[PDB]
Amino acid sequence: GKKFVARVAEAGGKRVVIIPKAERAKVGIKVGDVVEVKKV
Amino acid sequence: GKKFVARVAEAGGKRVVIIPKAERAKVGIKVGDVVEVKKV
């Protein structure tokens, strides 16, 4: 339930939210994890 | 404040949340928009 703020970016012709290593460590996110994305 | 569920994926050597066109339309997200990402 921990969260972080980010910006939608364009990478490889896709709209993505890049998750830096620091943010992964703070929120406890690994590849494959399910997340909730909310527009602010 | 609208939200959608997604999975952290790996693309271009980065950990990202791909946002499909349908999800962008439902949540009202454009590139550059600030979003909140919460681990479920």
Author numbering:
A (entry chain A), B (entry chain A): 5 to 44
Reproduce, without paraphrasing, sentences from the article in which this PDB structure was first reported.
Here, we study fold transition between distinct β-barrels by protein engineering and structural biology technique. Here, we discover that the previously reconstructed ancient DPBB sequence could also adopt a β-barrel fold named Double-Zeta β-barrel (DZBB), as a metamorphic protein. The DZBB fold is not found in any modern protein, although its structure shares similarities with RIFT and OB. Furthermore, the reconstructed OB fold could also be converted to the four-stranded SH3 fold by a simple circular permutation. Thus, these ancient β-barrel folds (DPBB, RIFT, OB, and SH3) could be readily interconverted by a few feasible mutations through the missing-link fold, DZBB, indicating their significantly close evolutionary relationships.
In contrast, design-4 was unfolded but still formed crystals in the presence of sulfate ions. The crystallographic analysis revealed that design-3 and design-4 adopted the homo-dimeric RIFT-fold. Thus, the short In/Del at the 1st loop position is the determinant for the fold transition between DZBB and RIFT. A single deletion in the DZBB sequence converted it into the RIFT fold. Most DNA molecules did not migrate from the well when mixed with the proteins with the stable DZBB fold (design-2, -18, and -19) and RIFT fold (design-3 and -4), indicating that these proteins formed large aggregates with dsDNA. In particular, design-2, -18, -19, -3, and -4 interacted with dsDNA even in high salt conditions (500 mM NaCl).
